[PDB]
Amino acid sequence: AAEPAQLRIGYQKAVSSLVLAKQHRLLEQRFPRTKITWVEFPAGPQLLEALNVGSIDLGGAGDIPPLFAQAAGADLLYVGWVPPTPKAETILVPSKSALRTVADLKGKRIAFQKGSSAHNLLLRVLAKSGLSMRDITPLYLSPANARAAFAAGQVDAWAIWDPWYSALTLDGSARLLANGEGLGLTGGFFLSSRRYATAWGPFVQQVMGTLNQADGLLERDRAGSIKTLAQVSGLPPAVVERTLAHRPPASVQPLSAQVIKAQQATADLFYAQRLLPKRVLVAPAVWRAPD
C-alpha cells in the first residue's frame, strides 16, 4: 500500500510531544519509506504561511492561525484536533509592574503573536472586563521577539504560552495576570494541505495516530521527557517540569462536532470583532479519514 515519498511536517518547539516525536524518530520508525522532514516554526501563523506556499504539507498550530489563514484564502484542511491546555495559555506582565488585574490592561501595550491562540486568549479575557482589542495597543511580535521586547521593558503585558510562561515566571521576569482557564478554549489543530490529505489520507491518519501516542510520553515517560526536552531546548529541567504540570493529556484526535462548532464560534467571534477580513467557514475545511 503506497505512502508518500516525503512528509515535510511543521512543528513548534513549544509542543513538547512533537519535539519528542522528532527526537525519538517516531514517524521514521512507523514510515520507513517516507522521508520525514521536521521543519520548526516560531509560532502558528508562520507555520500556516509555510503550509500555504507548500513549504510543509502538515503541521500543528493553535485554533487561531488556521482561521487567519482561511480568512486570507488558504485552502487548508483540519485533519486533527489537539485538546486545549488553558493553564499554558497566559497573559504575563513584567513582575515589577503595578498591573494586577485584567482591567489594568486598558490602554496598555500588549505583545502577542497576531493570529495565534494568544490573540484569542487576550480577546476572551479582555472581553470579561469589558475591554476589546481596540482598548489595548497590540505589539504584534513572534515569541522570541516579544521576549526581547519584554526583557527591554517595551511591553506592559505579553500573551504567550509555555515554555515562556514557565520560564519567565520561574526566573522572576513575569507575573501571571491570567490564563485560559474557564474560557472553553478549543485547543489546536493539525493542518494539512488539501492535496496531500486527499492523496494520502490513510497515511495522514496514521501520522496523527503516531503523534497521538507521542503526547503520552509526557506522562508515561515523565522524567525522561523532562531530561530530553531540557536537553533539546536548553531550558532548565525545572522549567520543563513546570510546562508538563500545566498540561493535561492533549493527544491529537479527530475533530468532534463540538470542536468544529467551537472553531466556527471562534471564527464568528473574530469576524464580529472585526479581527478577520472575511467570514470563515470552518466545516468545509474539516477532514476525517475513511474507516
What spatial distance separates the first Cα and last Cα of the chain, rounded to whole Å?
Answer: 15
Q: What crossing angle do the helices spanning 64-71 and 117-128 adopt, rounded to 10°? A: 100
Q: Across the chain, which distance is largest between two alpha carbons, in Å?
A: 62
Name which of 264, 243, 247, 246 is nearest 255 in CA terms: 264
CATH class in words for 1-84+185-215+250-291: alpha beta
Quote the CA–CA distance of 225 and 219 in Å, as a whole number.
Answer: 9
Please give the C-alpha separations between residue 190 and each of 78, 93, 102, 164, in angstroms, as whole numbers. Answer: 6, 30, 31, 22
Header resolution in angstroms: 2.0
Handedness of CA 241, 242, 246, 250 (dihedral sign): negative
Name which of 149, 164, 34 is nearest 89 in CA terms: 164
Residue 61 C-alpha from the chain's centroid: 4
User: What kind of architecture, by CATH, is found in domain 216-249?
Assistant: Helix non-globular (6.10)
Quote the CA–CA distance of 63 and 187 in Å, as a whole number.
Answer: 6
Quote the CA–CA distance of 232 and 181 in Å, as a whole number.
Answer: 29
Experimental approach was X-ray
Quote the CA–CA distance of 72 and 62 in Å, as a whole number.
Answer: 17
> Rounded to the nearest 5°, which phi and psi values hold at 159?
-90, 115
| Interacting residues of 217 by C-beta distance below 8 A, sequence separation 6+ | 17, 20, 24, 224, 225
Please give the C-alpha separations between residue 239 and each of 11, 18, 217, 231, in angstroms, as whole numbers. Answer: 20, 18, 17, 12
- Inter-residue contact 51 to 194 (CB < 8 Å): no
Quote the CA–CA distance of 104 and 102 in Å, as a whole number.
Answer: 5
Quote the CA–CA distance of 98 and 199 in Å, as a whole number.
Answer: 54
**Peptide bond preceding 237: is omega within 30 degrees of 0, i.e. cis?**
no
Quote the CA–CA distance of 61 and 260 in Å, as a whole number.
Answer: 15
Beta-carbon neighbour count of residue 109 at 10 Å? 15
Cell for 226?
Answer: 523532562
Q: Which residues pair with 38 in a beta bridge?
A: 9
Q: What crossing angle do the helices spanning 222-233 and 237-245 adopt, rounded to 10°? A: 120
Q: Which residues pair with 77 in a beta bridge?
A: 192
Using CA atoms of 57, 217, 228, 55 in order, give the dihedral in degrees to the nearest 10.
Answer: 0
**CATH fold label, 85-184:** D-Maltodextrin-Binding Protein; domain 2 (3.40.190)
Handedness of CA 158, 164, 168, 169 (dihedral sign): positive
- Inter-residue contact 63 to 269 (CB < 8 Å): no
Domain limits of the chain? 1-84+185-215+250-291, 85-184, 216-249
Quote the CA–CA distance of 78 and 102 in Å, as a whole number.
Answer: 32
Beta-carbon neighbour count of residue 107 at 10 Å? 10
For the chain, the three-class secondary structure string (H helix, E strand, C coil) is CCCCCEEEEEECCCCHHHHHHHHCCHHHHHCCCCEEEEEECCCHHHHHHHHHCCCCCEEEEECHHHHHHHHCCCCEEEEEEECCCHHHEEEEEECCCCCCCHHHHCCCEEEECCCCHHHHHHHHHHHHCCCCHHHCEEEECCHHHHHHHHHCCCCCEEEEECCHHHHHHHCCCEEEEEECCCCCCCCEEEEEEHHHHHHCHHHHHHHHHHHHHHHCHHHHCHHHHHHHHHHHHCCCHHHHHHHHHCCCCCCCECCCHHHHHHHHHHHHHHHHCCCCCCCCCCHHHECCCCC
Same fold, 1-84+185-215+250-291 and 85-184: yes
Beta-carbon neighbour count of residue 215 at 10 Å? 23
| Interacting residues of 231 by C-beta distance below 8 A, sequence separation 6+ | none
CA atoms within 13 A on the CB side of 76: 34
